[PDB]
Curated annotation (Swiss-Prot), chains A, B:
<dbReference type="InterPro" id="IPR001952">
    <property type="entry name" value="Alkaline_phosphatase"/>
</dbReference>
<dbReference type="GO" id="GO:0030288">
    <property type="term" value="C:outer membrane-bounded periplasmic space"/>
</dbReference>
<keyword id="KW-0479">Metal-binding</keyword>
<keyword id="KW-1015">Disulfide bond</keyword>
<dbReference type="GO" id="GO:0033748">
    <property type="term" value="F:hydrogenase (acceptor) activity"/>
</dbReference>
<comment type="subunit">
    <text>Isozymes 1 and 3 are a dimer of identical chains, isozyme 2 is a dimer of heterogeneous chains, one of each of the subunits from isozymes 1 and 3.</text>
</comment>
<dbReference type="GO" id="GO:0004721">
    <property type="term" value="F:phosphoprotein phosphatase activity"/>
</dbReference>
<feature type="binding site">
    <location>
        <position position="367"/>
    </location>
    <ligand>
        <name>Zn(2+) 2</name>
    </ligand>
</feature>
<keyword id="KW-0460">Magnesium</keyword>
<keyword id="KW-0597">Phosphoprotein</keyword>
<protein>
    <recommendedName>
        <fullName>Alkaline phosphatase</fullName>
        <ecNumber>3.1.3.1</ecNumber>
    </recommendedName>
</protein>
<feature type="binding site">
    <location>
        <position position="409"/>
    </location>
    <ligand>
        <name>Zn(2+) 1</name>
    </ligand>
</feature>
<feature type="binding site">
    <location>
        <position position="150"/>
    </location>
    <ligand>
        <name>Mg(2+)</name>
    </ligand>
</feature>
<feature type="binding site">
    <location>
        <position position="324"/>
    </location>
    <ligand>
        <name>Zn(2+) 1</name>
    </ligand>
</feature>
<dbReference type="GO" id="GO:0030613">
    <property type="term" value="F:oxidoreductase activity, acting on phosphorus or arsenic in donors"/>
</dbReference>
<dbReference type="InterPro" id="IPR018299">
    <property type="entry name" value="Alkaline_phosphatase_AS"/>
</dbReference>
<feature type="binding site">
    <location>
        <position position="48"/>
    </location>
    <ligand>
        <name>Zn(2+) 2</name>
    </ligand>
</feature>
């Protein structure tokens, strides 16, 4: 089963056939990509807000228009999927989902309302693919560059009526029915500590400083609880590297930042008529990103090494979280740098899958976003910025859908790509909930 | 080789598995969709400006979020393709193409600068797939709802340095080197008359009123020259239906409107804070569309019937032209109606291909566009509008990338879908110029 080794323009862009990305007929290669054998493992990579527009913009900037992302573009089976949410009151579709309803959809197979995690519109709990994988004896990992309490990694291990119920305090106030002291299952962080995935890596150390309002660990901070329940806690790249075993007896919990992990590249925010009034921008590496803080590609590798030891197999979710956050912030460099970061993690995943032979790798996004690539001389009503690309030309990015401080995500269908056993199920038009059923089936979870 | 008969939500949207579009594993069905046999015919359908966002918005409105376009969504092999143009002066990438450079790319296989038709950055001509098909003896058809001189159908039959060179007058002024009287090949309309495709249907009768400045037909209007050169001219549906033969001796030229054919649905223009200040809209059929004017689906059927008689095979291009124009106009209803219109033509094409067995059908767009689907309560800097969808819920559309009277197209990669022999070549990431090579090879044109 081949991965697309090179789909960059084959020659001179200005010449006949020079911009072609293909060098011959693809039929035979697609036939070799088709297999219904069971998958022993699944690696799901999520670019939050990484719709087709975000992928095109990052490619143009970092690899040039005729370039090619060795990870993101290398998946051979591609399709488009819908991710609409539900109106909680009426049950009718809500055309633009947030990260919580969408993460719930692929993780439980049931649509829900914006803001919900692991529950349907009647606030009923539904088991997630991670809980199911664990029940069957598979190793499980949940990796993200965001706070571990954020929507995407939280939907795999928590069931609360509002994504805001990070810890004990917000929960009592916003999710009374889930508040530990009122008899509920607990806050996102508490449920995360109970779910006990084998490998959990990300940011969000802040919330772990809260203290439980009830239960066995009442009065202990969530960090103490974790140590007490036997989790191996690591907080930097060296200690993360030192980990040699991660399992039910010694589950790994890596907290690498108080909030969201540092962004890869810095650049200024887009601005009104910024493509006209200001000079083009060249993104620059964030000095704070650090040799101390593991990258998304490192976390992914370490997670695969550990989850690997399980004979039954594993399920791993990896999230390039800040693509969406920088998109809301109208910051081209933060957004693109996070897309490049994700590509590196996709590459480690593909290398492993390529060798192993029984791993289904999927790369997609939870919803589309605001950024659009427009003509250089565009006079737009929103925020714009001109960037100096790898091609030595200027690309202009526009964010024109919000008068508020945060740009809105969007509802357009977007790319889903896959590689490995059962990858055929992402081709054509599908729904985000289909992804739950594809993964369950691929893994044979009954 | 199967078409996706049904990818609508399988049941109750609010229930587990109810929103799924798949009913079982797709592996076998995909293996059956794979064929490298030669294509006898090719039908290329283009939605101008129909990016994934446009497809999603039209689907939500007309079929409901869990709905499914029987034509557009039924193609089983899908991928994403890049359509960047070149800066004429530098030869570097220009991230946002216009309809002319993009149409040139899939029709000649060479990238070019915005505004160019059938020539590279050096202004050198390159043969089009239609000219090549014709030389090989295949019947050829070029159908559109725009003026026949517009970028999309023009790129198949003309080579001029600027899309604006509609007829004799604009050409002398704008394309001196192509001006007939200055020894050039002629205006778009004149080269169209020379190209002699067997079936040409669309609007743009206006320009045919011009008179040739030179050559055999100097002093005759372009309409006269057509009659003189042997073309069968039809201008309404009944006369179109009466045509029984179309070939090199009796080529058909249908002019159904002075300019662009009428739009299918009417609705108001999007407006500042329109989703907040004004009530939701329900689109309404255009009373002027007429029983007299063939629809795109009718033009397609007729063209297939006539091109069909050719034993060698045929090449047909069909354009749902006004999707792009209504998008520029920030008119949701016009935009959506034109996408539903294209769906019907896709349907006709698929029905024929399905029976015939040797027809490659491709549905894609030339570039992406402005419209975005945003949250209902969005307060945006641009033009917005709330619409009443088939689901009984409201969807909001936003156009926020231009302060001018025309919304800008965008540069995001977008969906390409295909069915039939050689369709595998549209899967994964490809380039718009690869489409030229895919069609030329599928057809065996040497
Ligand atoms: Zn999100
Ligand atoms: Zn997220
Ligand atoms: Zn977001
Ligand atoms: Zn166009
Ligand atoms: Zn067009
Ligand atoms: Zn346009």
């Amino acid at each position: 089963m081949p991965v697309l080794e090179n789909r960059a323009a084959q020659g001179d862009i200005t010449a006949p056939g020079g911009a072609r990305r293909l060098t011959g007929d693809q039929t035979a290669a697609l036939r070799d990509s088709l297999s219904d054998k069971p998958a022993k493992n699944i690696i799901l990579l999520i670019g939050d807000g990484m719709g087709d527009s975000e992928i095109t913009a990052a490619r143009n900037y970092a690899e040039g228009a005729g370039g090619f992302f060795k990870g993101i573009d290398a998946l051979p089976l591609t399709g488009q999927y819908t991710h609409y949410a539900l109106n909680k009151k009426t049950g009718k579709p809500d055309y633009v989902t947030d990260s919580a309803a969408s993460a719930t959809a692929w993780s439980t197979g049931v649509k829900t309302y914006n803001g919900a995690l692991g529950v349907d519109i009647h606030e009923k709990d539904h088991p997630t693919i991670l809980e199911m994988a664990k029940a069957a004896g598979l190793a499980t990992g949940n990796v993200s560059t965001a706070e571990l309490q954020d929507a995407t990694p939280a939907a795999l291990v928590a069931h609360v009526t509002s994504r805001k119920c990070y810890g004990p305090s917000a929960t009592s106030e916003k999710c009374p029915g889930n508040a530990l002291e009122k008899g509920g299952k607990g806050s996102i962080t508490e449920q995360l500590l109970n779910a006990r995935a084998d490998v959990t890596l990300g940011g969000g150390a802040k919330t772990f400083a809260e203290t439980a309002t009830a239960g066995e660990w009442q009065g202990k901070t969530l960090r103490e609880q974790a140590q007490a329940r036997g989790y191996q806690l690591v907080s930097d790249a060296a200690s993360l590297n030192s980990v040699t075993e991660a399992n039910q007896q010694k589950p790994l919990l890596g907290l690498f930042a108080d909030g969201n992990m540092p962004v890869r590249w810095l650049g200024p925010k887009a601005t009104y008529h910024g493509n006209i009034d200001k000079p083009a921008v060249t993104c620059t590496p964030n000095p704070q990103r650090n040799d101390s803080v593991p990258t998304l590609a490192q976390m992914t590798d370490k997670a695969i090494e550990l989850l690997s030891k399980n004979e039954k197999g594993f399920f791993l979710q990896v999230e390039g979280a800040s693509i969406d956050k920088q998109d809301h912030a109208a910051n081209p460099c933060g957004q693109i740098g996070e897309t490049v970061d994700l590509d590196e993690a996709v590459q480690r995943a593909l290398e492993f899958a390529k060798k192993e032979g029984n791993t289904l790798v999927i790369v997609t996004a939870d919803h589309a976003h605001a950024s659009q690539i427009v003509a250089p001389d565009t006079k737009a009503p929103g925020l714009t910025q001109a960037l100096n690309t790898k091609d030595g030309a200027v690309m202009v990015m526009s964010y024109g859908n919000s008068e508020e401080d945060s740009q809105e995500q969007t509802g357009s269908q977007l790319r889903i790509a896959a590689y490995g056993p059962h990858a055929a199920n992402v081709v054509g038009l599908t729904d985000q909930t289909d992804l739950f059923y594809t993964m369950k089936a691929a893994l044979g979870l009954k």
